[PDB]
Design a binder for this molecule. Sequence first.
Ligand SMILES: CC(=O)N[C@H]1[C@H](O[C@@H]2[C@H](O)[C@@H](O)[C@H](O)O[C@@H]2CO)O[C@H](CO)[C@H](O)[C@@H]1O[C@@H]1O[C@H](CO)[C@H](O)[C@H](O[C@]2(C(=O)O)C[C@H](O)[C@@H](NC(C)=O)[C@H]([C@H](O)[C@H](O)CO)O2)[C@H]1O
Ligand SMILES: CC(=O)N[C@H]1[C@H](O[C@@H]2[C@H](O)[C@@H](O)[C@H](O)O[C@@H]2CO)O[C@H](CO)[C@H](O)[C@@H]1O[C@@H]1O[C@H](CO)[C@H](O)[C@H](O[C@]2(C(=O)O)C[C@H](O)[C@@H](NC(C)=O)[C@H]([C@H](O)[C@H](O)CO)O2)[C@H]1O
Ligand SMILES: CC(=O)N[C@H]1[C@H](O[C@@H]2[C@H](O)[C@@H](O)[C@H](O)O[C@@H]2CO)O[C@H](CO)[C@H](O)[C@@H]1O[C@@H]1O[C@H](CO)[C@H](O)[C@H](O[C@]2(C(=O)O)C[C@H](O)[C@@H](NC(C)=O)[C@H]([C@H](O)[C@H](O)CO)O2)[C@H]1O
Ligand SMILES: CC(=O)N[C@H]1[C@H](O[C@@H]2[C@H](O)[C@@H](O)[C@H](O)O[C@@H]2CO)O[C@H](CO)[C@H](O)[C@@H]1O[C@@H]1O[C@H](CO)[C@H](O)[C@H](O[C@]2(C(=O)O)C[C@H](O)[C@@H](NC(C)=O)[C@H]([C@H](O)[C@H](O)CO)O2)[C@H]1O
Ligand SMILES: CC(=O)N[C@H]1[C@H](O[C@@H]2[C@H](O)[C@@H](O)[C@H](O)O[C@@H]2CO)O[C@H](CO)[C@H](O)[C@@H]1O[C@@H]1O[C@H](CO)[C@H](O)[C@H](O[C@]2(C(=O)O)C[C@H](O)[C@@H](NC(C)=O)[C@H]([C@H](O)[C@H](O)CO)O2)[C@H]1O
Lengths: 278, 278, 278, 278, 283
Amino acid sequence: GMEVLDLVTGPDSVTEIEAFLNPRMGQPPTPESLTEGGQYYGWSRGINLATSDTEDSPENNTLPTWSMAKLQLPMLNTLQMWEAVSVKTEVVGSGSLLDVHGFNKPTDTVNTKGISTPVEGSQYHVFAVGGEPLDLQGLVTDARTKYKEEGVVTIKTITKKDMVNKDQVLNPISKAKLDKDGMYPVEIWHPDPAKNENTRYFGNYTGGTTTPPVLQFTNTLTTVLLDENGVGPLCKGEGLYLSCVDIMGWRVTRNYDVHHWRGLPRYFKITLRKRWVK
Amino acid sequence: GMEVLDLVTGPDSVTEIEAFLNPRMGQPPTPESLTEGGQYYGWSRGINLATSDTEDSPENNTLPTWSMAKLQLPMLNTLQMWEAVSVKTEVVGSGSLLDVHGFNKPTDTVNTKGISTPVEGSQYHVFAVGGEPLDLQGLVTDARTKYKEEGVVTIKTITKKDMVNKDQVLNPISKAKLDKDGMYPVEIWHPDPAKNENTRYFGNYTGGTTTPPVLQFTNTLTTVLLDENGVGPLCKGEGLYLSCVDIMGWRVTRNYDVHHWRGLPRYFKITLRKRWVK
Amino acid sequence: GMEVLDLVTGPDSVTEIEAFLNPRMGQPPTPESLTEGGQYYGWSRGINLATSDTEDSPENNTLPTWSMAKLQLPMLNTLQMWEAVSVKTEVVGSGSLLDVHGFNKPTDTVNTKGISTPVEGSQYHVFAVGGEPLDLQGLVTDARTKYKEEGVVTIKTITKKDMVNKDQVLNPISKAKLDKDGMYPVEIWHPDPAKNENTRYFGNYTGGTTTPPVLQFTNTLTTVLLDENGVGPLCKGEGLYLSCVDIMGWRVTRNYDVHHWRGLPRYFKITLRKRWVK
Amino acid sequence: GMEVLDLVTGPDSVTEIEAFLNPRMGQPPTPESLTEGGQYYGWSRGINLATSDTEDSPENNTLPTWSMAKLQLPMLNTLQMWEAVSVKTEVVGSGSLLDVHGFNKPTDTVNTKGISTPVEGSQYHVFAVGGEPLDLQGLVTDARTKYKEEGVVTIKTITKKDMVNKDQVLNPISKAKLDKDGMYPVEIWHPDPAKNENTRYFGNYTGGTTTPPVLQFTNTLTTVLLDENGVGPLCKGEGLYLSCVDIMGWRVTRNYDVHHWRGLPRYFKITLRKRWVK
Amino acid sequence: MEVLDLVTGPDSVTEIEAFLNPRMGQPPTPESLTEGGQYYGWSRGINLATSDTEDSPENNTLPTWSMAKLQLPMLNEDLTCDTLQMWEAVSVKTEVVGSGSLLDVHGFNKPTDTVNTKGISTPVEGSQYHVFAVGGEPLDLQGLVTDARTKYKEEGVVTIKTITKKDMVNKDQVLNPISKAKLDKDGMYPVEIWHPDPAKNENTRYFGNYTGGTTTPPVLQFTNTLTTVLLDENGVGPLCKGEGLYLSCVDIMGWRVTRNYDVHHWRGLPRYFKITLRKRWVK
Ligand SMILES: CC(=O)N[C@H]1[C@H](O[C@@H]2[C@H](O)[C@@H](O)[C@H](O)O[C@@H]2CO)O[C@H](CO)[C@H](O)[C@@H]1O[C@@H]1O[C@H](CO)[C@H](O)[C@H](O[C@]2(C(=O)O)C[C@H](O)[C@@H](NC(C)=O)[C@H]([C@H](O)[C@H](O)CO)O2)[C@H]1O
Ligand SMILES: CC(=O)N[C@H]1[C@H](O[C@@H]2[C@H](O)[C@@H](O)[C@H](O)O[C@@H]2CO)O[C@H](CO)[C@H](O)[C@@H]1O[C@@H]1O[C@H](CO)[C@H](O)[C@H](O[C@]2(C(=O)O)C[C@H](O)[C@@H](NC(C)=O)[C@H]([C@H](O)[C@H](O)CO)O2)[C@H]1O
Ligand SMILES: CC(=O)N[C@H]1[C@H](O[C@@H]2[C@H](O)[C@@H](O)[C@H](O)O[C@@H]2CO)O[C@H](CO)[C@H](O)[C@@H]1O[C@@H]1O[C@H](CO)[C@H](O)[C@H](O[C@]2(C(=O)O)C[C@H](O)[C@@H](NC(C)=O)[C@H]([C@H](O)[C@H](O)CO)O2)[C@H]1O
Ligand SMILES: CC(=O)N[C@H]1[C@H](O[C@@H]2[C@H](O)[C@@H](O)[C@H](O)O[C@@H]2CO)O[C@H](CO)[C@H](O)[C@@H]1O[C@@H]1O[C@H](CO)[C@H](O)[C@H](O[C@]2(C(=O)O)C[C@H](O)[C@@H](NC(C)=O)[C@H]([C@H](O)[C@H](O)CO)O2)[C@H]1O
Ligand SMILES: CC(=O)N[C@H]1[C@H](O[C@@H]2[C@H](O)[C@@H](O)[C@H](O)O[C@@H]2CO)O[C@H](CO)[C@H](O)[C@@H]1O[C@@H]1O[C@H](CO)[C@H](O)[C@H](O[C@]2(C(=O)O)C[C@H](O)[C@@H](NC(C)=O)[C@H]([C@H](O)[C@H](O)CO)O2)[C@H]1O
């Protein structure tokens, strides 16, 4: 398990696996009906605001959460372990944001004309590949936020106690593991840099309200997953963990400026090799 | 030929081919008359907006589509195939956007003075070179969008069924191939990262409504098309596929802020070599 | 030891230490109460403005200060010294800025709708690793600013005299050392480039009032601390000094646009090796 | 001089030539008088707008044109040719844009106060070095634009016929050579990527109306002119061609927001070597 | 001058440091914080033209180049010797200090809430200009102005007219090779007039950048880990003529805006230089 030896050679010593992770912006995949809520799939529901400085209770379907998948690798067996060497990853569908013919708040609000305002604002892109769940560190805007006690994993879920003022900075007690898809809000749970020895993660954030969204995509870019010692994530029990979130901004409706988060799916193609371990 | 062998040497073992792909923003090349619609060539027609949350019917000539060309390579036939090594590509005509003396919405709307507002807003630049058609993955803003059944290839064209809520995220069923110029809307069809083993594509997106357009151009830049194994796209049946879209933003008229998409043509110069295959 | 010799080899000759430094934006860690002030931890209190050109008296809890920590390394004693080779550092919690459901100034102020305006504006990111306290150089916007005498270390604290007009530019008399956490205002005290021979510091500033905050984070980036001669900071008396400030911008309230600074915590993982010295 | 052989060695086998090209924004160098039009030298005259969708008649002195110069090299004549190896090029005078004390549209228009608004907006920087005139490809915003017949070289000058709708995209008929300084409008004529085998060009465009101008300048940067085969432009008949345009944006007056283009001069220092040719 | 081998031995390499304070318009004196000294590090309030033909900026509203000449140790007892030694500038660590001070948003500038006169004191924003140079002789300057009609003061600033003894011509709005000078005095050459001359400066390295606009966010990086190489393409750094080393800079961060008629004041910051020099044999 611990001591890393030579690369295994011979038939089937290398494998490639691919997966797509759909975004988890708030509306679940079901109901599928385009008149019963399914029309919001790929988006959050309308963001609901605090009613006072002491009453902030966001609905679960307004909170983007981490996407995750655990993939099973070919059975193995000094022992052998699968080692993640590299990944090609791509966020797909930015071209869909060129739809400016819909019924969003129009650019000319005097005549109700122009174009349907495209998705704009705060953007958040993180992906990770590891041999165990992504380790998470909690940190919130407001320790007083009344997150729901059902259907979501928050700091109180883990500690069994209300949040404290330290949860607005780094409180080492407030940790979790990304072990469920669509359950851990991204405004609460961050990659833990004090752990994640067996995972590589890459994140970026751009804020603002009207910020132009930016994205690049190509099938020619490889992300190396080997550490400073030439060792990739080692997959415990032949399980490979993929984690991501890809927020593009908000669309804004014609009714009291209601905002809906927009997310996009992420492709992963991971190259793995067998590694001798002791 | 699946197995890639040595490079072919001797007379005419290397070739160089060039092409330009004109943009397909909505107005077709004909009619040519500058009073009958030809004056909009290089642009879309005026973007028409949804009339309700459930009534979004964009006209075909308001939707930018993929440009594509299939080029015939010198005849050949252990067999030989043409291998695309590199490409020099350039978007031509950004200097034309320095025309601020026209009849667009003026910069001083109070007095109808200043300059004619230049093209601004959302921008989209993708090119691809491959030995078969570019593989496409469908993904839309709104699965309820009522695209025309004739004159465009959309998800319904492929599936023979209405779009589903999954089409707003990644639905593996919604796939196509870029086999026709000016027919596949870019707000629907994206490069499929799960396929395109024999094509290289490079894309970028910048959104917003008044975003400054940015472009670089030079005859000194070479894009390598060789993969991680040193193998370029292999041209099946001696056909080379070029695909692109180059949206610079919109111009805005003096009449109810009507927007017209602006596109620019793309130059390709591809270097190819003969490769032994079996 | 001033003369640097060979690296020490053998058992325990290399060590790794980690720490997090919480931000010091103005509100202290106590009281912890989420009603009596603890709700502002990780933030400043409401920024108070000058009442005239000659009356600028900022409150201590409105002034972000440097974070610092002195870490004790393993006992060592031609002598040996600990040498800081490299650091992996990360600013944690940018995802928490995606909370736009609170009670900040809303994006639609006419109807009190839209979203809770996220953190925006001036940003400041500096970190340092050294074998002694970070050397500081004073420089202020206004030498007339009346800082509190107690509770902050300012130029007057050091000189025992009022600031002079030269303190608005570079005055070599106005120097200090970063020897206390949460005490040295970042609008006064800057890394001194004329000293810090035994410290590496890295800073950036982005100004403005509504500027989108930008942050990257990954566990794959290593910052080398070796100088041009291959020598890292040497830890005097086995003490390692970490210093930082990470301002993301301000939040704005619904009452007279009151601004509160937002800061985020910084993780450090330092690799050290024993060095022979004479 | 088709087959390129060895480099020539010996006395005077390498040479350096320098030149500055002044901008050609619309006002000619004469009259010199600062009351008769000379005050506009370095700028365009006030941009005049179309009066309808079918009446766009820009005046020649409102249209920036390409700068060019043909330089004579030392006499030479297996023959020898001058080969351009590299160029150091710089745009001079960006500091002059720090003049915000003039009579431009003020930053506070409510009270007519503040500062004189500095040059802002669309920017266009292109330079070329070659052994023959820069090859130009025509492309316009509007094929209906009524350019003057005398005083500018436009598409009609070349074809002897009105522009066609194809001229709004890539029309290979619409070609020219940059053989005159201050005559070819940059909104019409672009470097032709299908030609220019013996010229290197480098261009960039940034659009918008109030975009901050950006410029870097240093005497430490060398641009290599050698192609992929290590051969620079070969100077036919010992003539070296320099081409450029450097638009910084517009100034805006206090009278009906009249805009004037601003251009800056470009320095070139070219290193050339003698090459044996057959 | 033929450049030969590097000199070896005791004291063949040296490091020297200096800070250059900004020259935004208000001189260092008077020092009093009620008599004008409160503006040191800033310009005085920018005064505007009163017509298209009447543009008379005051000297204290015009940022000028900072410069310093440093004298290095004498190397040659006898200049008639066939082979001599010169100081060669190899590299420089340079840093603009004090961007953190722009985080003061608690002052009496134009406030961000103009309805209630609340919010924050608007931070420094707008046009930015960063140039530094290191050379073995003064920085060569090329004149180029926005307006050849600008009526600069004849005393207190070095302008094109100072040099030519004649009024500016329309050519001075583009490149006029007649309009040249050398940066031989601190706080005297306006940066809206005088630019590094790319046709000279063979013995100087300069690095400049400009970002315009009115409300543009200021951006700055600072670190003690970044070395700027001064060696040319042939491996030779600036050679110090008569052992003189020239440092030149300007670092404009933008303007602050007051509560009285949006009066703007330029803000500048000081720049640190640490130059590594070595002795070089020459003939
Ligand atoms: C429909 C509704 O009012 N829903 C409330 C919910 O109301 C419950 C109950 O469901 C309802 O039938 C009954 O009349 O009243 C009770 C109690 O009030 O109560 C919950 C609180 O637990 C919410 O307040 C909920 O409101 C919805 O909350 C969503 C976030 O959870 C979101 O903001 C909804 O807003 C949208 C939406 O996302 O669905 C925003 C969207 O832009 C709108 N679409 C269009 C085309 O206008 C829709 C739309 O108005 C409704 O979905 C149509 O019914 O709302 C918000 O309604
Ligand atoms: C002219 C018109 O109304 N066209 C309609 C079209 O109407 C047809 C037919 O043309 C008309 O004579 C008849 O009365 O009605 C029938 C059908 O009822 O119907 C189609 C839908 O079937 C469209 O509604 C069409 O309207 C045009 O739609 C275009 C998008 O497909 C686009 O928005 C047009 O808008 C522009 C244009 O691009 O042509 C915008 C442009 O900026 C305008 N130019 C100027 C200088 O103002 C032009 C211009 O107003 C018209 O083309 C008239 O010359 O319109 C939109 O008109
Ligand atoms: C509460 C108050 O007035 N505090 C004053 C303080 O007043 C003291 C004393 O506390 C008070 O009981 C008594 O009436 O008066 C004495 C002094 O005469 O005096 C100090 C100066 O010595 C300050 O003037 C202080 O005012 C606070 O100053 C803070 C900066 O130091 C800051 O601006 C406070 O503003 C906030 C805050 O950060 O606490 C801004 C925040 O957004 C507000 N929150 C909400 C939800 O509205 C709070 C809030 O109004 C109060 O904290 C609730 O009491 O204020 C500012 O109050
Ligand atoms: C002076 C004038 O009206 N010029 C016209 C010109 O008019 C001629 C003739 O000169 C005039 O005496 C007579 O009454 O009418 C004839 C027309 O047959 O006609 C040409 C077209 O043939 C133009 O319309 C011209 O107008 C000028 O056009 C320029 C573009 O070519 C430009 O827009 C001029 O605008 C400026 C300028 O650049 O000179 C803008 C500038 O900001 C202004 N400066 C100030 C300080 O206000 C000047 C200024 O108003 C005048 O130049 C002062 O005479 O104009 C535009 O005038
Ligand atoms: C005070 C004044 O009017 N100064 C004039 C100057 O006037 C002289 C003399 O000083 C005065 O006593 C007498 O009445 O008139 C004579 C002759 O006119 O004249 C010169 C021109 O020769 C200027 O017009 C000067 O005005 C000053 O010009 C400066 C630029 O050179 C600058 O714009 C001054 O503006 C500021 C300043 O920088 O000092 C802007 C600053 O924001 C202001 N500070 C505050 C806290 O408001 C100050 C302030 O108003 C004055 O300094 C206090 O009197 O002015 C501008 O005044």
